[PDB]
Ligand binder design. Sequence first.
Ligand code: HEM
Ligand code: HEM
Ligand SMILES: Cc1cc(N)nc(CCc2cc(CCN(C)C)cc(F)c2F)c1
Ligand SMILES: Cc1cc(N)nc(CCc2cc(CCN(C)C)cc(F)c2F)c1
Ligand SMILES: C[C@H](O)[C@H](O)[C@H]1CNc2nc(N)[nH]c(=O)c2N1
Ligand SMILES: C[C@H](O)[C@H](O)[C@H]1CNc2nc(N)[nH]c(=O)c2N1
Ligand SMILES: [Cl-]
Ligand SMILES: [Cl-]
Ligand SMILES: [Gd]
Ligand SMILES: [Gd]
Ligand SMILES: [Gd]
Ligand SMILES: [Zn+2]
Lengths: 401, 401
Amino acid sequence: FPRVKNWEVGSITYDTLSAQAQQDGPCTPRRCLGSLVFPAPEQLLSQARDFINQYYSSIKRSGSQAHEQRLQEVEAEVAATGTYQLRESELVFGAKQAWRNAPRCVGRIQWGKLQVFDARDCRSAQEMFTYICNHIKYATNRGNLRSAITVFPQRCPGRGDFRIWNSQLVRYAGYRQQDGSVRGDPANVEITELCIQHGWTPGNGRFDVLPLLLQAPDEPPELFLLPPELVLEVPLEHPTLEWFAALGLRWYALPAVSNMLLEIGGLEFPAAPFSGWYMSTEIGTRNLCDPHRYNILEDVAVCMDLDTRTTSSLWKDKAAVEINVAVLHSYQLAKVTIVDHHAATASFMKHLENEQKARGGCPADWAWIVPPISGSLTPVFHQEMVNYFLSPAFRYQPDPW
Amino acid sequence: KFPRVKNWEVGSITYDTLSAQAQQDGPCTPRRCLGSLVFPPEQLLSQARDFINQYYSSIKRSGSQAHEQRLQEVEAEVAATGTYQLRESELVFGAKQAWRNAPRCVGRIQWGKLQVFDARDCRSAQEMFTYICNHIKYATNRGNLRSAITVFPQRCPGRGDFRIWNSQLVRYAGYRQQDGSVRGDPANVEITELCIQHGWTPGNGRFDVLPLLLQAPDEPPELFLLPPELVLEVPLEHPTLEWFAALGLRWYALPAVSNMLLEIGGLEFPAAPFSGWYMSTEIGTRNLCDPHRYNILEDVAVCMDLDTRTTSSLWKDKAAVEINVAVLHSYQLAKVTIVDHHAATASFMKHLENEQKARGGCPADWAWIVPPISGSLTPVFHQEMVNYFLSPAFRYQPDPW
Ligand code: HEM
Ligand code: HEM
Ligand SMILES: Cc1cc(N)nc(CCc2cc(CCN(C)C)cc(F)c2F)c1
Ligand SMILES: Cc1cc(N)nc(CCc2cc(CCN(C)C)cc(F)c2F)c1
Ligand SMILES: C[C@H](O)[C@H](O)[C@H]1CNc2nc(N)[nH]c(=O)c2N1
Ligand SMILES: C[C@H](O)[C@H](O)[C@H]1CNc2nc(N)[nH]c(=O)c2N1
Ligand SMILES: [Cl-]
Ligand SMILES: [Cl-]
Ligand SMILES: [Gd]
Ligand SMILES: [Gd]
Ligand SMILES: [Gd]
Ligand SMILES: [Zn+2]
């Protein structure tokens, strides 16, 4: 079992949980591909059996009558129908485990506090839209954000999938421009073109909230506009740089990933959007300063009167720090939940300790856990980590178009 | 079978066909990735044959007279002696190749410019010391640093090794107290206690340059005082924070790793110190701000009058940026070669491009190439990388005790 060192303290542990990793990753003894972003009844039965075992362990009933009854029920149902249905309590536990198991999530200290909305009865794209609006309203909670997931019907033979085409529930449009540039968010050029192609009347601002493209089984996607008062946004200002407000920057309160697949005991839920709250570097560093996103770094450093003609002035570093200050200050001013990268990484360290005691390890992706500014000033930098795949899980899936 | 490698800033794609040559298997398996871990008789002919083939291809001389002749002499040498001696040019070529192959080195754009001192006829810790002294004075070059390596005799059966007990040629002492904690560099507490134990009169200071412990085969070590005028150091001041100088901080000019083992064509050199010049985050971020190193971050924030009461002021990030600024300003004022993390990572992207054309890929350790501050502000953050072991190589090796 892999030995894992923390270099700040000197601590050493062994990740025995990795030995139970079922599915395979991209690395081999020849070559590590850790840094890559994107790496049958009997086999459904064996996944389902393992998950039912996990559920009954969690409720201190391993080996009991009800445990064997459920194992028997599942096999009989797979034999009769080729699939099976989760009980409500099994779904809640499986959604929480999927979050717990997610190696790229630094916020997992919260994994047990998750509101699970059971939308497995959803019938249409119109009902899907109503469920999603309720999710946004509950999770946003006027700025006091609450973690939640809404679970739409599982994949099943004989019918297409429910899908949300948008990558998050709230996203800003990206408009390919006159001179070939992009106005708005360049990460969203494709979904923006698809919304237009499906009848949306575009805007032409930098922060235009996108409509939703929702797909019911065996139906083309259907366009739904979000009511503006459902989408809470934060205008960005800086506590001491008063010209920062004149940049006209904004971001939205709710980070709600909507394009991932939830897998529980062999069953697959292609539509299951989940939401927490932001860590400030996601907005301040990646979304606003990535060269292929809003790319504001040089404009901010020029306004700060930094010497941008030489790298060794560290003008890039200084401007990025103040952009992250602006994000934190603005969300706090607006009373919208946010966590900074120091507090978030410290709480992740507590999670690793909790998980070492509970399960003997924790799957973690070092390159995603370490924040994109001030990496080695956070404790996770000095923590060796072991990356592997446990189920239940959130998985990437192909775009439906 | 050839890993696809994407750059996410630009969208470009390459394939690492070079990876299909990795000898020493790394630590990862399909089951789990250990990429974040710091530390994971006639088979000599196999590695010697392959290395000689490497040599003659690099000089466009595969399949011709001189190439075949050299194959037989190593064959006869190993048959007659159980080992072989490298030609001078091969020793040079192998030193540059080991540098070129180091997955954790961001400065490899320089790999063709390397001064190779051949100390293979050395015998005794006294000869070592004068060799080390020639290197240090050559490499330092009054602050116009020049990359250099010195190659002490190779390992052979039945006889002890040449070893430098220090991890670098210049290290600062670390002294315990009436209370455990360390004055000086906590990373060197152990070699400090060895040097004192072997007869060295310790100092009282936070920046005492340690003596050398040099080990000829089969003899206990011998202490050597480095000539004070040969160890070039930089007192640290800040361009605009006039009190920063009063903190009394300094760092040395020459980074010279002296504890790694150089392997060429199956030959092992446990004493082969190599040196380049510093990238400024090594000093300003890791050495001065790591919690287990000089840990100066809060002292600098106090002097800057920052609000250390809340993490979301980003007082840690601000003080760290100014410490890096002070390192760069001080080294440039002293006319001592240094490179900032923006310049260095941009040069590495060019190196990746060169290596793609020259060899079809480049072994790179993402977690070590990405700098420890401002990670996503540098281009290497957005570049996927493949990590694997090629020979010749620099390898880690046990402490000589
Ligand atoms: C409660 C506060 C939360 C915080 C502060 C947080 C933090 C983060 C951060 C910073 C990332 C990296 C994302 C990126 O760089 O694009 C991430 C990824 C992720 N989070 Fe969390 N998260 C939270 C809640 C949740 C919840 C509620 C779930 C699911 C129930 C979840 C599941 C995931 C998954 C699956 C990923 C990986 C996504 C990907 O690879 O694209 N997180 N989280
Ligand atoms: C010329 C300027 C150079 C620069 C700017 C540079 C930069 C760096 C940096 C920042 C690291 C990371 C090490 C750490 O974080 O502790 C590193 C590692 C390394 N470099 Fe370079 N380097 C240079 C020259 C060289 C030379 C001349 C050699 C050998 C001939 C070399 C071989 C290595 C090796 C083997 C490592 C791995 C160190 C380890 O794993 O402990 N580098 N380099
Ligand atoms: C629930 C939650 C909380 C939080 N605090 N942050 C997030 C952001 C997740 C996220 C991941 C990515 C990786 C894309 N990569 C796979 C190509 C892209 C995104 F656009 C995105 F939003 C989610
Ligand atoms: C030639 C050269 C040039 C340059 N610019 N930098 C270096 C840094 C080498 C180096 C490696 C390490 C890793 C060992 N540790 C993680 C266990 C630690 C250090 F403190 C250190 F200095 C070398
Ligand atoms: C190429 C590299 O893997 C890529 O840029 C990764 C690195 N680490 C990351 N970490 C987080 N949290 N989010 C990301 O999008 C990325 N991107
Ligand atoms: C645990 C982790 O692997 C360790 O802290 C690594 C991370 N990346 C690094 N990168 C560099 N350049 N140098 C280091 O010492 C480290 N340390
Ligand atoms: Cl986001
Ligand atoms: Cl160093
Ligand atoms: Gd002001
Ligand atoms: Gd402007
Ligand atoms: Gd003062
Ligand atoms: Zn790996």
